[PDB]
């Protein structure tokens, strides 16, 4: 095996319309989708790794007034740097304190790495709850 998430690829997909409270949905259901306006900015661009794509997502969040309006000043500083914003304490898991990008269909089962319709934004807690039920 060689890891697909560590190889370059091309972002694809549509995302979904979300509201200014999108990150609240990250702690529910299968998490939040990639916002359509973020998909619109990243679609067809090449990224060096999934981590590079993840930085680009949070950079794009920082640039979008509606998707960043709910962040407080400290979280706005984080996303301005391409860092993931901190979740509420009650959604953290140990040293996992920030929103996570996860693949809905696992890459090992045919899911694509940079397919934005296959990526969900979750809190650490919601991710672990999902994983534990598998």
């Amino acid at each position: 095996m060689e890891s697909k998430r560590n190889k370059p690829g091309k972002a694809t997909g549509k995302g979904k319309p979300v509201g200014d409270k999108w990150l609240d949905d990250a702690g529910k259901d299968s998490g939040a989708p990639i916002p359509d306006r973020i998909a619109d900015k990243l679609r067809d661009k090449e990224f060096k790794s999934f981590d590079d794509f993840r930085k680009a997502v949070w950079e794009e969040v920082s640039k979008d007034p509606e998707l960043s309006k709910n962040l407080n000043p400290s979280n706005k500083s984080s996303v301005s740097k391409g860092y993931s914003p901190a979740t509420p304490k009650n959604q953290q898991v140990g040293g996992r304190k920030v929103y996570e990008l996860h693949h809905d269909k696992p890459i090992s089962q045919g899911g694509e790495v940079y397919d934005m319709d296959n990526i969900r934004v979750t809190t650490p807690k919601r991710h672990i709850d999902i994983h534990r039920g598998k």
Binding site: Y83, K97, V98
Partner: protein, 84 residues
Amino acid sequence: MELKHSISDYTEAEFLQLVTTICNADTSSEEELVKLVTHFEEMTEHPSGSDLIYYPKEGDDDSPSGIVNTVKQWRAANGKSGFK
């Protein structure tokens, strides 16, 4: 492994610099930032943890000096040690 960080090893000035680094995200990496947030939580001992920085209560001042004052007052109210 790393022993608990203690707030009484910091002066108020030093603690204000640390909080400002967090609020500005003035770090080399996200990992370094989350390490500082963890250390902040260990030092304050405040049950709200990183929420003091990112999810302040309505009415709280979430500027760096605001957060430092909230921590100082809470520690005072709860019989804990203050700054160096």
